[PDB]
Amino acid sequence: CPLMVKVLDAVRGSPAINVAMHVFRKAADDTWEPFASGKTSESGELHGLTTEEEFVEGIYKVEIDTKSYWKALGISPFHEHAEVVFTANDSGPRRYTIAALLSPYSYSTTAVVTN
Amino acid sequence: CPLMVKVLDAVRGSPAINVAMHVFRKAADDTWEPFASGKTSESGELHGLTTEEEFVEGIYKVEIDTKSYWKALGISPFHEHAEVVFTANDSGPRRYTIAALLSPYSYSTTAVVTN
Amino acid sequence: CPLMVKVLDAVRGSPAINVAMHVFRKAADDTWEPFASGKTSESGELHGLTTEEEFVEGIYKVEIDTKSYWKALGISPFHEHAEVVFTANDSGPRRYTIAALLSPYSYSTTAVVTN
Amino acid sequence: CPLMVKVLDAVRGSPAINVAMHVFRKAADDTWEPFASGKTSESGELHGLTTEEEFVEGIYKVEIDTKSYWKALGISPFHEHAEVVFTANDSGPRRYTIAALLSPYSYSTTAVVTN
Ligand SMILES: Oc1cc(O)cc(/C=C/c2ccc(O)c(O)c2)c1
Ligand SMILES: Oc1cc(O)cc(/C=C/c2ccc(O)c(O)c2)c1
Ligand code: NA
Numbered sequence A, B, C, D: 001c002p003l004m005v006k007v008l009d010a011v012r013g014s015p016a017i018n019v020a021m022h023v024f025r026k027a028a029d030d031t032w033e034p035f036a037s038g039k040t041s042e043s044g045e046l047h048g049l050t051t052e053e054e055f056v057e058g059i060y061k062v063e064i065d066t067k068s069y070w071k072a073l074g075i076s077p078f079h080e081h082a083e084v085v086f087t088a089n090d091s092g093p094r095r096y097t098i099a100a101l102l103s104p105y106s107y108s109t110t111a112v113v114t115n
């Protein structure tokens, strides 16, 4: 599992469950190509987005649908989504965990990169 | 000030000075139209991006070039940029302050929205 | 301003107004001696805590009553308070801005230290 | 495992390894009694601090020694420690994960509380 995303809810003190996200990869023509997508589990984690073979060097974007998450709880949030854009694997294969901590008007995101 | 952006450096405990950013507005064809841009001042702030009359309902994206900021400090960062995507002015004019707190592998962002 | 504290609300996208805090300074016997206190203004800021002459080397603790803030909004929060503990003025006077971004189950804090 | 602490490094994009922390519980005389302590593993996690039987209702403080962590990396950080103070188990037993994301001049902390 070279790419995992974990999402936490700062209002309820819980994993952010059933949060949709889409991953894109920048194509040679500078456009964003669909790469993978999924929803977080009851643990707030999304595993199995990609494989070592498929997850080549490139610029990737994870777009987390935070707006639908808050709206389902009856909250009108600030952001359309939380976005994480990064170059991956340019020095060889790495494992990436992207974490996001969500509030209605704020988010924090970090990465853990391991060899 | 209809739209102000404030950027802080979590490594050095300082405003993030000379940080470049572009602001885009989503067009009817889902493309990102240029809207505003600038660099942060010595206080870490970017004022004067737009005027009340020009800043109407839309989806806006602030794309902050955090990568160049860290590279100038000899730090290889995780993100290509920090991006903040939000609907603005859907209930008429508001004043928006977007804050971003930067680390090499992480960023936090919040909004203050005032009537 | 030798010491200023700014508090933001990540749920409502606003300054956190009327947030009470006390500041303590560590005594030689490791107890916390009262040093300063106040409540945030309508801008979420607390100015005038100390003067340059009074604010000398020491370990300081800002204890922000976040629990009362959330309870006034009908929200049961996680923390009893947010606390920020730091050495100040060990290289002579500096100006300190402490920022705190509050959610019910989370807080973020940063410092801006200027000569 | 009713209490777990996870610590992440926002500068290096890694778990924060070998971070010491001390847990205290408020005694009947309002003093902080030692409760447990430990160091984070290679995953940045500290497990096994307590048991269901021992982790009674109370006010608890987790004091994470962030200063020693940064100093070992040659960084002079702002905070003496990152502190998390909270009431636990007052509505019956819960499982708590405390997470902290560390930078030299900033930290973010959140809690995941599960039944
Ligand atoms: O931007 C932030 C801010 C924060 O305060 C915490 C996190 C991450 C928390 C976390 C908690 C449990 C995990 O297993 C994990 O991988 C991450 C990310
Ligand atoms: O821990 C954090 C996280 C974050 O995302 C933002 C801030 C600070 C925001 C801020 C906003 C306006 C100001 O004038 C200011 O001094 C600070 C602090
Ligand atoms: Na390469």
Ligand code: NA
Residues within 6 Å of the ligand: D090, D091, D092
């Ligand atoms: Na009870």
